[PDB]
Each structure stands twice: as C-alpha cells, then as structure tokens.
Design a protein around this ligand. Structure first.
Ligand code: PCW
Ligand code: PCW
Ligand code: PCW
Ligand code: PCW
Ligand code: PCW
Ligand code: PCW
Ligand code: PCW
Ligand code: PC1
Ligand code: PC1
Ligand code: ACP
Ligand code: CLR
Ligand code: CLR
Ligand code: NA
Ligand code: NA
Lengths: 34, 264, 985
C-alpha cells in the first residue's frame, strides 16, 4: 500500500550524486586520454 | 544612416521589400507555426497522461497551513473603526460572500454524518457532510448582519488548507492565544478548535461536489475601557500529530498569526 | 654626450684602433676584443613583470563587469544581513561564484598567453643577424654579436648595419635613417667629412639603420649600448597602432552586444521595479540579465585560437610577427610571387653557351671533362675574360680545397654560377683580377639591369682601357653595336640579330636564365692613359660595344611549388608572377610550376598558332597574358585594371622595383587582398604596401624580413598554403563560437517577458539565469576553438570582407530566431510539465502571478481544489527554475554538436575534439550536482528533479539537430539557392 505526501528523496539524490560522479570521472578520463 | 529606407533603386529598405521581405516573413511564419504546433502537440500528450481527479504528486503539499478570512488590505492587519461603517464594510461583505454556501438553506442537500469518525468513502457517489453555520455562534450574519464589528468584537474565520486524501490523526484542534498580554479575550466559538474528523478526507474538487470545509471563528473582544490598541493573535493546530505546526521555514504551516487594530 | 670620430682623419684611424684599413684586424685580435669588450647586444629591458600581465588578464574585458557584479552581490548580502533577520545566502554564493569564475578565466587566459608569447619569443633568437666583415684580408659572414670595434665591414643593399661604423670607401651607398631623421628619403654616404655636427655628417652610420642600395666598406667605431641608439632611452622596437581587421570586427561586436545587453538589463530592472520587486532583488536581476546577455569568455576563445595557431606555425617553420595577422592571410585573395628564390631553388648551373652563331651544350663534369664541346676558338676565351672581370663574387675564406661545385661563393646566384663555370674551364680568377686593374666598377642594380667594369689591358697591344659589361641580352644587345665571330670583329646586321633572337627563344624556352656579355677596347686617342672617370660624367663609351655571346644557366622550380600553386588556384586565389626576367623565361617557368595551365594561350601564342600577326587577334580570346615591364610604364590606371581583371593567368616580366609597387596598388584597388612574396631589397616597399607581406628566411635580405608580416624560415612556398588554411580556420572557429554563444540569450530573457505578459509564475530566476550562462556558455564555447578544419576548408572561395563578416544578419537571425526559440520552447515545456504534475494545470496559471507572489495569501487553490501556502508553492516554482536550467543544458547539447561544423556533416567531421566532449560531460555533471546536492535548496534554491523530468527537453533537442542537418543538406544540394542566401551564416 503506497503512501502519498512522501517521496524517496534520499535515494533519488544519492543516485543523482552517483550519476554526477560518473559523468565527472568520464569527462576527466576523456580529456586526458592516453 | 543616409539612404536608410530609400525606396528607389534595386535596394529598397535594406532587403528587397517586394521579394526578400515577403519571402523571409513567409519563412518565419511557417517556422513559428510548426514550432507552435509541435509545442501544442507535446503539451497535449503531456496532459493526456495526467488524471483529472487527483494530482500525480502530493509530496510537496504534505501538511495543511491555516489561513484567516477575510484577507485585509495590508498583510493580515485588520484596521476598523466602530463609528465608521465604511471601514469594516469590506470585511462584512467578504464574510457574507464566503458564508453564503454555509447557510442552512444552501446546504440542505448535504447529508448529515456522525461526529468523531473519519468519513472515508469508496464508491463514486462521494457525498459531503454539512457544516451548520450555527456552530459559529455570534460570528455569523444570521443574528446580526455585522459579524461582531461596530461593537468592538470582530469575528475572523480561521480555516485549514485543503489537501486531497489527507487523514488527520487524533483530534485536530485550533487554539488561539492572544500575544497582547491576554488583555482581550479570544473566543474560539465551536467550543475548542474542534475540527471534526467527519469532514476528512477531501477527495478533490471534481469528485467531492458540494464539499464545505470546517471553519473556526475567533472573536477578539475589545473592552470599552481601552479604546484602540493592537491585539496580536496566533492560532495553531494542537491536537493532531499528523498536522505539523512547528516548521520554522514556513511560518503559515499549521499556524497563522494576525493583528487586529480598533479605533474610536 | 656627443663624441665621435666623424671629423677625425683616416691617418689616425690605423693608429687609434691598431687595425689595417684594408686587411683589418686578425682573428686573434678579434677574439681578444670580444673577450674584453663583450658581445654586440643591447641589454634586454624588462618591460613588465608577470604580476602586471596577470592583473591585466583579471581586469580585462567583461571580467571587470563580473567583478562589479560580485561586489554588488556582496554589498546586497551585507545590506540584507544588516537589515533583516535570517538573511538569504543567494547573494553570497553568487558573488563567490562570480569572483571564482573571473579568477579561473583570468588564470586560463594568462596561461594560454604565456604559452603563445614563449612560442613567439622562441623565434626571435632563431634568425641570426648575419654581418659581412673583412678579417685577415678575407670577407666572412659572422653573427652580429661577434662584431667588435676596429674591424672593417661591408654594407650593401638590404643589409642591416651591424654597428656604428665610419665609412671609409662607399660607392653608390645610400642609407635610410628614418629611425633618427624621420624621413624615408635615402641619404648618400661618402668618406669625406662634410658636416661638423656628429649626426649631420655624411661619413658615419649610427647603427640600427639599413643601406637601400650601393656598397660601402666601413670601420666599426662603436659596439653595443655605446652607439647612438644605446645612449637614448627610446624603444627601438616601437610597435605601431596597427589594428587587424579581425580585431576591429571583434571590438565592434563587443561594443554592440554590450550596448544591447545594457539596454535589456536597464529595461528589465525598471520593469521589475514596476512589478513590486525590491531594490536588493531588482539590482541582482539587472546584474544577472547584463552578465547573461554579454559573451564573456569570447576573449578566451580568441586567445586559445591564437595559441593554437602559434603552435601550428612553429611546426611549419613560419615566423609570424603578429598572430592576429593570420586572419588577413586566410582572407588573402591574390598572391604576387617572385620567380627567383621563391618559385625556384635559386641554384644555378651553367647549361648552354651561344657564341660564334652556334649553341654549345656545357656540362660541369668536374671529372671526365666536357661532353662533346671543347675549347673552340678565341671567342670562348674572350667570353671567359668578360665573365671573370665583370663578376664581383668570390669564394669564402678557407674554401679552396673542395671541388668548385661544392665550394661556397659569397655572391649572387648568377655570379656564383658564372664563377664556378669559369673556374671549371679557365682557372685562378684571383690571379685574373690581379692581372687586370679594376679601376672603375658600376654596381649592378635592377634599374639598369647591367653590370659594368673598366680594366687596364696588360697585353702586348694594350689600349689600357677595356670595358666589360654583362646583363639582360635584349638590353645588352641594344647598345653593343658590333659582334665578335670567330675572333674577328664584325658588323651586326639583321640576320645576326634574328639568329640571336632565335637562340634566346631556344635557350629561354626551356626555363633558363640567360646573360649576355660584351667587351669593348676603348680608343686611346679619345682617352689617354691618365683619365678621371666619374659616374656623373659620361666619360667612358657606354654605347657602341662589341657583343660576344650568351650564357644560359638552369634553375629548376622548387619541388613543393607546383602543389602549393595548384592548391592556391583551387582555393580561389589568383597567383601572379612578378619577375624581372625575360618574358620567355618567365612564361616557361610559369608553365612549369602551373601558374599558366595547359589549354590557356596568350595573345601572341594564339597569333602564332593561327599563323596570323599579333594584331587583329581579339585580346579577350586569351585568358593568360605575359605583360612586359617596359609596356607597363605607358599603361593607364584603367588600362591596368583591364589586365588584372580579364586575365586569369598573369605574368609580369622585365619589371622594376617601382612597377611591383604599381602592380600591388592596382591589385589592391581591384578589391583584392594581396600577399606579396619578396626577398630582396627591390621588394621592400611592395611588402609594406601589401596587406600581408611574406619574406624569405634565408634568401631574403635584412630589410625584406623587417618589412614583411611573415617570414618563411625555410623559404618553402608550401607554407603560404598552410598559413591561408590556418587563417581560414581561425575565422571559422571564431564564428562558430559566436554562433553557439548567442543562442542562449533568448531562453534567458523570454521567461521574464512571458511572466509579465501572461501573468504566469516566473519560469526562470536570477540564480538559474547565471547558472545557465556560467555553466553552458563558457567551457563549451572555449572548446570550439580547438575544432579541426573542415573537409573542404581549402576548397572554398576567399571570403569577401564586405559580403561576409564575423557577425552578419544571418548569424543573428539564426541564433535569435530559430535555435534560441527552440531552446526557450523546451524550457517552457519542462516548466509546464513540472507545474501540471503537481496540480496547477497550464490554463490555471494564466493570471496567477499576483496571488502566487503574495507572501500573505497562503491559500492559493489548485486545479484539483487543494490550497497551497506561500512557502509550499515557491518550492515548486524553484523546482521549475531548476528544470528550466537542466532543459537548457539538454537543448544546448545538440546546439554545440551542430555548431561543431558549418557546412559538413558531424559524422564526417568526427569526434577528434576532446575538449567539446569534456565540456558536454562537465556541464551535465554540474547540472546534476547542482540539482541533487544536499543543501542546495537552502543555499541556491535548487531542488532535486525526478528522473522522468530530464527527458522533457529531449524532443526539442532532437529538433535542433534534425533541422540543422536537413538545412545543411539542402545547402550542399543546392548551392547559391535561397537557403544559402538567407540561412547560411
Ligand atoms: C548525436 C546526437 C546529438 C543529438 C542528441 C539528442 C538528445 C538525445 C541523446 C541522448 C544521449 C545522451 C543521453 C544522456 C541521458 C541523461 C544523462 C543524465 O545526466 O541523467 C541524469 C538522470 C538522473 O536520474 P537519477 O539517477 O536521479 O534517477 C534514479 C532514481 N530512480 C531509482 C528513482 C528511478 O539519469 C537518467 O535520467 C538516465 C538514467 C541513467 C543514468 C546513468 C547513465 C548515464 C551515464 C553515462 C556514462 C557512461 C559512460 C559513457 C562513456 C562512453 C561515452 C561515449
Ligand atoms: C519563446 C517565446 C514564446 C514563449 C512561449 C511560452 C509558452 C506558451 C505560453 C502559453 C501560456 C498559456 C498556455 C496554456 C494555454 C491553454 C492550455 C490548454 O487549455 O490546454 C488544453 C489542450 C487540450 O487538453 P486536453 O483537453 O487534451 O486535456 C484533457 C486531459 N485531462 C482531462 C486529463 C486534463 O491542450 C493543448 O491543446 C495544448 C496546449 C496549447 C499551448 C499553446 C502554446 C502556444 C505557444 C506557442 C509558442 C511558439 C512560438 C511562439 C513565437 C512567439 C514570437 C512570435
Ligand atoms: C520534405 C521536405 C522537408 C523540408 C524541411 C526543411 C527544413 C530545413 C530548413 C529549411 C529552410 C528553408 C527551406 C526553403 O528553401 O524555403 C523556401 C521557401 C520559399 O522560398 P523559394 O524556394 O520560393 O525561393 C526560391 C528563390 N530562388 C528561386 C531564387 C532560389 O520558404 C518557405 O516556403 C517557408 C520555409 C519554411 C522552412 C521551415 C519548414 C518547417 C521546418 C521546421 C523545423 C523547425
Ligand atoms: O591546463 C589547461 C588545459 C590546457 O590545454 P593545452 O594547452 O594542453 O591544449 C593543447 C591542445 N592540443 C592538444 C591540440 C595541442 O586546457 C584544456 O586542455 C581544456 C580546455 C578547457 C577550456 C576551459 C577551461 C577553463 C576555462 C574557463 C572556464 C571557467 C569556469 C567555467 C565554469 C565552471 C563552473 C563554475
Ligand atoms: C569544470 C567543472 C564543473 C563541475 C563539474 C562537476 C563537479 C561535480 C562533482 C560532484 C561529485 C559527487 C560525488 C558523488 C557523491 C560522493 C561524494 O563525494 O559526495 C559529494 C559531496 C557531498 O557529500 P556528503 O558527504 O555531503 O554526502 C551527501 C549525503 N547524501 C549522499 C545522502 C546526499 O559534495 C562535494 O563534496 C562537492 C565537492 C566537489 C564540488 C565541485
Ligand atoms: C560542497 C559540498 C557540500 C556538501 C554538504 O554537506 O553541504 C552542507 C551544506 C548544507 O548541508 P545540510 O546537511 O545542512 O543539508 C541541508 C539540506 N537538507 C536538509 C535537505 C539535506 O551545503 C551548503 O550550504 C553549501 C552548498 C554547496 C556549496 C555551494 C556551491 C556553489 C557553487 C556553484 C557553482 C555552480 C554554478 C556556476
Ligand atoms: C504548419 C504551419 C502552418 C500552420 C500553423 C498554424 C497552426 C498551428 C498553430 C496553432 C495551433 C495549436 C495551438 C492551439 C491552442 C488552442 C488552445 C485553446 O484552444 O484554449 C482555449 C482557451 O484558451 C485560453 O483561454 C488562453 C488563450 C491564450 C493561450 C493560448 C494561445 C494560443 C495561441 C497560439 C498562437 C501562437 C502563434 C505563434 C506563432 C505566431 C506566427 C504564426 C479553449 O479553452 P477552454 O475554453 O476549453 O477553457 C475553459 C477554461 N475553464 C475550463 C476553466 C472554464
Ligand atoms: C531590441 C534591440 C535591437 C537592437 C539591434 C541593433 C543591432 C545593431 C545595429 C547596428 O549598428 O548595425 C549596423 C549595421 C551595419 O553593419 P556593421 O558592419 O556595422 O555590423 C558590424 C559587423 N561586425 C560585427 C562583423 C563588425 O547596420 C545595418 O545596415 C544593419 C541593421 C540591421 C538590419 C536588420 C533590419 C532591421 C533594422 C534595425 C534597426 C531598426 C529597428 C526597427 C524596429 C524596432 C523594433 C523595436
Ligand atoms: C527580442 C530581443 C532582441 C535582442 C537584440 C537582437 C540583436 C542582438 C545582436 C546585435 C547585433 C550584433 C552585430 O554586430 O550585428 C551586426 C549586424 C550587421 O551585419 P550585416 O552587415 O550582415 O547587416 C547589414 C547587411 N546588409 C547591409 C546586407 C543589409 O547587424 C545585424 O545583423 C543586426 C540584426 C538586428 C535584427 C533586427 C531586430 C528587429 C526587432 C527584433 C525584436 C525586438
Ligand atoms: N650580376 C649580374 N650582373 C648583370 N646582370 C644581371 C646580374 N644578375 C642578374 N642580371 C640580369 O638583370 C636582369 C634584372 O633582374 P633583377 O635582378 O631585377 O631580378 P632578379 O632576376 O635578380 C630576381 P626575380 O627573378 O625573382 O625577379 C635579369 O634579367 C638578369 O638577367
Ligand atoms: C516530434 C516527436 C519526437 C514528439 C513525440 C515525443 C513526445 C510524445 C514525448 C517525448 C518526451 C515525452 C515526455 C517526457 C517526460 C515526461 C514527464 C513524465 O512525468 C510524464 C510523461 C512526459 C510528459 C513525456 C510525455 C511524452 C513526451 C512528450
Ligand atoms: C514573444 C517574445 C517574448 C519573444 C519573441 C522574439 C521574436 C519575435 C524575435 C526575437 C529575435 C527576432 C529576429 C532577430 C533577427 C532578425 C533578422 C532580420 O533580418 C529579420 C527579423 C529577424 C528574423 C527577427 C524577427 C523577430 C525575432 C524572431
Ligand atoms: Na555568456
Ligand atoms: Na548567454
């Protein structure tokens, strides 16, 4: 039974930060490509 | 700019008005027509996904906030004069307009419900319990057309904001305490705050037809000995654990504050 | 302080400096003086320290505007904290961001400029200033540092004067003293003391000047800062206020965009004050609008482009004095090139000899001797005597050990070839010149085109006056009245002249330089043994000589020249050959290198092909012309323009230094940007007059290199094409960056206009306005300066400066009316989606502005009946702001990807640009971090976006890519059509 007035914002922002880290790492790696 | 808009020669008004301007205007008309059509179609597709009875997300409006009625001219500050009927005419007119559906003849269709029990509904009928205006004793226009004004005892309606599908826990109650050293007496009229549970949940503007929300009427009594003065009153929800009233970022969430200033 | 040796006599010069006037000091004495007096170099003055330039970068351009914005944000935060309780930190976190952005951009620009300046400096010491000094009686070419006080040096045309020297023997020597006097009129130099004043005398040179023509032996009297230039504190290398056209265009665009942005900011500030804003909020809104509507980081793109060009020119050995002058090189539409030294290797080998009415094949063949031809009769001896006496070229010191062909000669190419040939056949030119006393010598010049000498005859039947002359065969034959055949002097009739013309056609037609020779025995009755020859007086019999023969030497065209000429003529650049050689030789060389193609005929060629006279042939039937230099003297300004605009393949033969200037000015009159390739002193004014002047790093003189805007350090003509390609690439990258930058202005100003007009809640806020601009418009726009050249970069016609500009009516139209509008639509769609999924349907938002923004109406009703508190609906509004920023990021992905190229497919372009991909990844990472970082809601009012709220701008991001792809496909399919007329920016 779902409950409104509540959103899993902790997991959402955790995964958003993980995606931001992945993008930052990939952009760094592509720039300094050997 | 010499010869800026000169008509003669092959060059007239910069680009050739006969051909260049017409062609570019046609191009931009077609371009913006296509853009508008695409935007309209995308908006239509977005609106098809939504439901017409309940919002998709209700996590940004988790708890109700109180609000007073009528709305004064300047920031919840009620200024009126007893001997000047034009000062409080706006408040009286607003209160009469708001309390018109609450009159006994207007809410004859609404059903009667037992007190103290949350009125949950499943079928598509979605009846609405009636809120008798007699609860707001001495703060309704049935006895006196002026809602306590012109006698130094103004009436203000404090009402909780509506949220679809909100089920308050415990027994909600609005308690108003005068911050003016309690020199006047603030009388919440439906006994205590006494927000009955039979008016919850709210099922939406479309499903819940004829819904009348609970009201709380406060009446600051300005004693004749002290004519004038300013009374600061704060009303908050005190009996329900569901309804938060301690948030500091939002000063209206679960509570409301106002000032009443009398004259003469 | 004015002390010199100008008035001092020649007798004391030997005593004072202890050096011989003719032989000069020895190597040991030179080494001792160098170790004692030090090198001949002025002390390098430190102009500005590193902290001066770094501050200039920090406070240059729009960075000062951003400093003002940050200071005002700090002031607003201070006032808010002093006035209210619980102040907002938006202003603090905005001022910090602005200051950090300014510092980072300034540091990056400083680093790029340091790299560029270091690379440019690494070339100033690359070219050694060579000076000719007579040491131990032999002339040697050394560096300018090793020149010491006491020795004698030779200064000639186009040679920069090494140091303060006292002239002891000058002939035809004229110096240019524009550095001191200010006038460009040459001043003659004579050993005799004339004027008392040290500066006004005519027997000394004051360093840092050059000799336009003539030669002079002079004793160096001062070295280093002891000269006149070292005494004064004025900067010798005084840069002039020359503004390149690209810099002018950039400055004009900056001025216009700044004016527009300031107007918009002031208008929005006033409008917000009308809409019941607060001053501390209205000023921040105005700052945000002004900063977001100016292209900050435009100067960083220019700096990156300049640094990349400096890096590329260093690998091609192309010294560039001003890196902003490469745009003109890419905009070049005409190239005027010299035949000898530029289109030819300048290595001359004697090939044929015409004499005795016969052509003889001459081959060097140090071993096995000649092929078939032999000593022959006395005509060959007379010709060898002429060549030996006329030449002023000698071998370098300590070089008479290796074979003559491999030996080095300190003279001109023709003189060196003649010297090697006459030492191969005859021998001991030193003893030959000892035998004949060279009393009088007339220096060679392009004005006269002949070299003359007077010698004393040592033979038994000696008239004591032999006049030897060499030069251009048609000019030489014009005065040599007789001809020497079989050793007997004979009259010159029409048949012999026709035979000479046929010989010139046969030898010259193969592409060989031909020199004619004459010797005359002056009568003793007219001239006794003691005669005072003077240049001003007629004296010697300049006319009525005796002809001997012609010597024709080959000079193969440079290997890389034909391909460079083909590339230039395929890129739309008209290549004109301006040479002082005969039309036959010039035309043969032009056909060899490809300047005159196969299938294009001259008027004379058509007449000869049809066996009809030169007249009666319509000149328009010929697209290639070979104009003689003497005919150009009588041509009119209108007549020259007909030549320069009707003929595709133009050669100018037998020209003069002034006529080259005439040709350059005519070409510049005919709306063309001219690049002149000159090396000698006879190209000094043409290089200055040309839009872009190119000198030669080896064959070029020391005045051509000082007057040119570009120096080919390996003389390679295949570097002009590289320079043109890089000049085109700079402009392409700059305009791509400008087009990408200008797209984001509409999405940042349309939300406020729609807010005012439709009374909807605000779609975009100041913090998000500055996040759109500082995140998506700086790094991705700097990344477009690294973009590679197009597939057909060198297959497009040169840009017309008037028709095609850096910012035109088609770039503005595109950026502000198509891409910007699509981006704004995407942002508005995302805003509507966010507001509708929470309860406020799009039609409920019309007119909600007054109630939405009211702090005391905490009951604003949904479309579903719910009622919202003020602090509850502002969370949704700020989530809409965040989504607007995130959707602008998404729609600016496929705007950078489409600005990556201008007319080719992105798949054809490729993904070599790592900076662009880095910029995309970093801007999306920054967007995600700003959205999902904890504490952004309190600080920057940024709230997390739900996963499905990222794809709202996807249909509008694909629309930009598809539209650009289809329009560029249409442009390629139908060139010159309506789309390319109106849409191609
Ligand atoms: C040539 C074409 C030009 C024209 C282009 C037109 C536009 C179309 C092009 C699309 C290609 C790029 C697509 C980018 C997608 C968005 C990237 C991004 O920023 O998305 C952020 C969101 C955040 O969602 P969340 O995590 O908060 O939701 C988790 C919550 N839950 C549990 C609740 C549901 O994520 C999402 O929506 C997506 C979910 C997946 C996110 C992780 C994957 C992205 C990482 C990629 C790096 C991989 C390495 C690549 C190296 C090689 C590169 C060539
Ligand atoms: C960049 C400069 C311009 C910026 C433009 C900003 C955006 C435009 C702003 C518009 C403000 C008003 C928007 C709302 C208008 C009424 C919308 C409406 O009433 O929606 C209803 C219809 C149909 O809904 P339904 O019955 O299916 O729902 C039933 C499904 N249930 C029951 C679940 C709900 O939805 C539809 O038709 C689609 C909605 C129609 C929206 C029209 C938008 C027109 C915009 C054109 C811009 C194009 C470029 C302009 C260039 C300007 C310079 C010359
Ligand atoms: C299947 C066909 C797909 C076509 C899609 C094209 C979109 C790519 C961009 C097109 C740009 C304009 C195309 C065009 O060539 O347009 C021209 C026409 C009328 O010019 P004309 O040919 O009579 O001039 C001839 C003058 N002469 C004779 C001297 C040459 O302009 C017009 O009708 C209005 C042109 C409207 C262009 C936008 C069309 C919708 C695209 C939306 C994407 C967002
Ligand atoms: O060391 C910085 C590097 C230097 O490159 P290089 O000279 O070795 O390239 C050599 C290029 N080749 C490899 C073609 C020779 O640069 C790079 O590689 C990448 C260049 C990235 C351009 C932007 C760098 C930052 C400048 C301004 C941004 C200011 C802040 C923007 C907003 C941030 C969030 C607030
Ligand atoms: C040109 C460059 C333009 C910007 C490029 C993108 C830069 C973005 C970097 C974001 C990296 C995020 C790393 C992934 C998370 C792990 C981490 O490293 O966390 C990042 C910390 C916050 O971590 P927290 O400990 O507050 O946990 C947060 C508690 N949770 C998770 C429940 C919300 O944010 C920080 O350090 C921020 C430090 C870096 C700031 C930049
Ligand atoms: C740096 C990373 C810091 C991570 C961190 O631990 O944050 C600490 C504080 C607030 O954290 P809290 O735990 O009280 O969370 C409160 C929010 N709640 C309760 C919803 C979780 O965050 C802050 O004040 C600082 C916010 C991040 C620092 C400002 C970055 C400004 C840069 C802008 C460049 C991009 C535009 C160009
Ligand atoms: C292909 C190229 C050639 C063709 C191009 C032209 C065709 C495509 C262009 C437009 C068609 C799609 C847009 C239809 C929207 C219908 C919305 C509607 O009809 O809303 C109507 C009402 O609106 C409004 O009050 C708002 C009006 C303003 C906002 C909408 C404005 C629409 C105008 C758009 C023109 C934009 C032009 C931009 C380019 C300019 C150069 C051409 C119907 O609402 P109601 O009475 O049911 O509300 C009842 C409300 N309650 C339920 C509360 C009682
Ligand atoms: C809203 C504000 C818009 C402001 C736009 C100013 C653009 C720059 C103007 C300028 O100096 O151009 C010089 C130009 C001359 O070009 P230019 O060579 O000076 O441009 C500089 C080019 N670079 C940067 C490469 C050096 O003037 C023109 O001939 C073009 C003017 C615009 C042509 C388009 C037609 C509209 C006319 C605009 C003015 C009248 C508007 C009437 C409608 C008003 C509606 C409100
Ligand atoms: C809405 C907001 C509009 C904001 C201003 C739009 C223009 C901003 C950039 C200013 C121009 C920059 C520049 O240097 O342009 C030089 C260029 C000059 O380049 P050009 O030489 O190609 O222009 C003249 C060309 N001939 C001579 C053939 C006619 O100027 C422009 O293109 C100005 C474009 C103005 C567009 C007209 C605006 C009309 C009203 C718009 C809505 C208000
Ligand atoms: N040392 C010398 N003495 C006499 N005549 C010479 C000479 N060197 C060259 N000439 C002749 O003088 C003529 C004038 O040539 P000039 O010196 O003006 O141009 P140039 O051929 O040396 C350089 P370019 O070929 O690139 O125009 C040439 O045709 C050449 O045959
Ligand atoms: C021209 C073509 C490409 C248009 C077709 C694509 C349309 C129909 C797609 C593309 C993007 C899509 C939207 C992307 C994100 C959201 C938010 C989500 O919470 C509800 C669905 C909604 C609103 C989608 C509806 C359908 C959508 C508008
Ligand atoms: C609706 C409000 C908020 C914003 C709308 C802006 C629109 C109408 C403006 C912004 C940019 C403008 C364009 C900018 C440049 C030019 C080039 C000129 O040669 C013809 C007009 C044209 C093509 C303009 C047409 C009108 C235009 C598209
Ligand atoms: Na910008
Ligand atoms: Na911008």
């Amino acid at each position: 039974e779902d409950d409104p007035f509540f959103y899993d914002e902790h997991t959402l922002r955790k995964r958003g930060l993980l995606v931001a880290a992945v993008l930052f790492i990939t952009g760094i790696i592509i720039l300094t490509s050997g | 700019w010499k010869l800026f808009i000169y008509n003669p020669t092959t060059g007239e008004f910069l680009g050739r008005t006969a051909k260049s301007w017409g062609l570019i205007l046609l191009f931009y008309l077609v371009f913006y027509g296509f853009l508008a059509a695409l935007f309209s179609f995308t908006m239509w597709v977005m609106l098809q996904t939504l439901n017409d009875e309940v919002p998709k997300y209700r996590d940004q409006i988790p708890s109700p906030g109180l609000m007073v009625f009528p709305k004064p001219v300047t920031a919840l500050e009620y200024t009126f004069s007893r001997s000047d009927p034009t000062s409080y005419a706006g408040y009286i007119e607003d209160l009469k307009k708001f309390l018109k559906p609450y009159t006994l003849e207007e809410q004859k269709n609404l059903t009667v419900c037992p007190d103290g029990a949350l009125f949950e509904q499943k079928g598509p009928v979605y009846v609405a319990c009636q809120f008798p205006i007699s609860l707001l004793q001495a703060c309704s226009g049935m006895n006196d057309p002026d809602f306590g004004y012109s006698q130094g005892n103004p009436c203000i309606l404090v009402k909780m904001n509506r949220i679809i599908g909100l089920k308050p826990e415990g027994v909600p109650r609005i308690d108003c305490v005068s911050k003016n050293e309690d020199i006047p007496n603030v009388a919440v009229y439906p006994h205590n705050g006494m927000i009955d549970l039979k008016y919850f949940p709210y099922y939406g503007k479309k499903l819940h037809v004829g819904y009348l929300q609970p009201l709380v009427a406060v009446q600051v009594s300005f004693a004749p000995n002290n004519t004038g003065k300013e009374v600061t009153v704060e009303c908050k929800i005190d009996g329900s654990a569901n309804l938060k009233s301690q948030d500091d970022r939002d000063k209206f969430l679960g509570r409301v504050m106002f000032k009443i200033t009398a004259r003469a | 302080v004015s002390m010199d040796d100008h008035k001092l006599s020649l007798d004391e010069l030997h005593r004072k400096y202890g050096t011989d006037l003719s032989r000069g000091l020895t190597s040991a004495r030179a080494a001792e003086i160098l170790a004692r007096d030090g090198p001949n170099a002025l002390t390098p003055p430190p102009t500005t320290p590193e902290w001066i330039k770094f501050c200039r970068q920090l406070f240059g351009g729009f960075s000062m505007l951003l400093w003002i914005g940050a200071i005002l944000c700090f002031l607003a935060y201070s006032i808010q904290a002093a006035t209210e309780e619980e102040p907002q930190n938006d202003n603090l976190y905005l001022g910090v961001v602005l200051s950090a952005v300014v510092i980072i951009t300034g540091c990056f620009s400083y680093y790029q400029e340091a790299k560029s300046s270091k690379i440019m400096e690494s070339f100033k010491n690359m070219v050694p200033q060579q000076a000719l000094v007579i040491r131990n009686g032999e002339k040697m070419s050394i560096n300018a540092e090793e020149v010491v006080v006491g020795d004698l040096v030779e200064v000639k045309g186009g040679d920069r004067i090494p140091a303060d020297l006292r002239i002891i023997s000058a002939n035809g020597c004229k110096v240019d003293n524009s550095s001191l006097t200010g006038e460009s009129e040459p001043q003659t130099r004579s050993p005799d003391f004339t004027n008392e004043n040290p500066l006004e005398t005519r027997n000394i040179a004051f360093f840092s000047t050059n000799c336009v023509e003539g030669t002079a032996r002079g004793i160096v009297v001062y070295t280093g800062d002891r000269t006149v230039m070292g005494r004064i504190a004025t900067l010798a290398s005084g840069l002039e206020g020359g503004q390149t056209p690209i810099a002018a265009e950039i400055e004009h665009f900056i001025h216009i965009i700044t004016g527009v942005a300031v107007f918009l900011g002031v208008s929005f500030f006033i409008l917000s004050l009308i809409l019941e804003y607060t001053w501390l909020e209205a000023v921040i809104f105005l700052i945000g609008i002004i900063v977001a509507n100016v292209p900050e980081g435009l100067l960083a793109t220019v700096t990156v482009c300049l640094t990349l060009t400096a890096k590329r020119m260093a690998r091609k050995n192309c010294l560039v004095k001003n890196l902003e002058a490469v745009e003109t090189l890419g905009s070049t539409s005409t190239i005027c090139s010299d035949k000898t030294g530029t289109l030819t290797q300048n290595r001359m080998t004697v090939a044929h000899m015409w004499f005795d009415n016969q052509i003889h094949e001459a081959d060097t063949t140090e071993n096995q001797s000649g092929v078939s031809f032999d000593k022959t009769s006395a005509t060959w001896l007379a010709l060898s005597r002429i060549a030996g006496l006329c030449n002023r070229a000698v071998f370098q010191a300590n070089q008479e050990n290796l074979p003559i062909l491999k030996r080095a000669v300190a003279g001109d190419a023709s003189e060196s070839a003649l010297l090697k040939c006459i030492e191969l056949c005859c021998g001991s030119v030193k003893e030959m010149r000892e035998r004949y006393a060279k009393i009088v010598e007339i220096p060679f010049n392009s004005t006269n085109k002949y070299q003359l000498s007077i010698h004393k005859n040592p033979n038994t039947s000696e008239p004591q006056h032999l006049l030897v002359m060499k030069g251009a065969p048609e000019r030489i034959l014009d005065r040599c009245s007789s001809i020497l055949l079989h050793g007997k002097e004979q009259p010159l009739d029409e048949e012999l002249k026709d035979a000479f013309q046929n010989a010139y056609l046969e030898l010259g037609g193969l592409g060989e330089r031909v020199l004619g020779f004459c010797h005359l025995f002056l009568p003793d009755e007219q001239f006794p043994e003691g005669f005072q020859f003077d240049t001003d007086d007629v004296n010697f019999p300049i006319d009525n000589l005796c002809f001997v023969g012609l010597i024709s030497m080959i000079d193969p065209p440079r290997a890389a020249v034909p391909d460079a000429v083909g590339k230039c003529r395929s890129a739309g650049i008209k290549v004109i050959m301006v040479t002082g050689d005969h039309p036959i030789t010039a035309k043969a060389i032009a056909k060899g290198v490809g300047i005159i193609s196969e299938g294009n005929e001259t008027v004379e060629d058509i007449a000869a092909r049809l066996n009809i006279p030169v007249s009666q042939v319509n000149p328009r039937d010929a697209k290639a012309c070979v104009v003689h230099g003497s005919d150009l003297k009588d041509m009119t300004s209108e007549q020259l323009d007909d030549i320069l605009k009707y003929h595709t393949e133009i050669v100018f033969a037998r020209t003069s230094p002034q006529q080259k200037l005439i040709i350059v000015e005519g070409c510049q009159r005919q709306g063309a940007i001219v690049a002149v390739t000159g090396d000698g002193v006879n190209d000094s004014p043409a290089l200055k007059k040309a839009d872009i002047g190119v000198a030669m790093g080896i064959a070029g003189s020391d005045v051509s290199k000082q007057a040119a805007d570009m120096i080919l350090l390996d003389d390679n003509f295949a570097s002009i094409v590289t320079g043109v390609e890089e000049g085109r690439l700079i402009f392409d990258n700059l305009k791509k960056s400008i087009a990408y930058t200008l797209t984001s202005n509409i999405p940042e100003i349309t939300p406020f206009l729609i807010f005012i007009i439709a009374n909807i809640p605000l779609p975009l806020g100041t913090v998000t306005i500055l996040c759109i601009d500082l995140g998506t418009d700086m790094v991705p726009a700097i990344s477009l300066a690294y973009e590679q050249a197009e597939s057909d970069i060198m297959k497009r016609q040169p840009r017309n400066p008037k028709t095609d500009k850096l910012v035109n009516e088609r770039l503005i139209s595109m950026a502000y009316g198509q891409i910007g509008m699509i981006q704004a639509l995407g942002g508005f769609f995302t805003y509507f989606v966010i507001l509708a999924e929470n309860g406020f349907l799009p039609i409920h938002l019309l007119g909600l502005r007054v109630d939405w923004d009211d702090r005391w109406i905490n009951d604003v009703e949904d479309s579903y009946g719910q009622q919202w508190t003020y602090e509850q609906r502002k969370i949704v509004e700020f989530t809409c702001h965040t989504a607007f920023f995130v959707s602008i990021v998404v729609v600016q992905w496929a705007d950078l990807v489409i600005c990556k190229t201008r007319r080719n497919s992105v798949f054809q372009q490729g993904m070599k640009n790592k900076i662009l991909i880095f910029g995309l990844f970093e801007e999306t990472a920054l967007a995600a971090f700003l959205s999902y970082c904890p504490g952004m809601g309190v600080a920057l009012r940024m709230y997390p976006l739900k996963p499905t709220w990222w794809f709202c701008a996807f249909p509008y991001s694909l629309l930009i890519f598809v539209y650009d792809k289809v329009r560029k496909l249409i442009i390629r399919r139908r060139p010159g059509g309506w789309v390319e007329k109106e849409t191609y920016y």
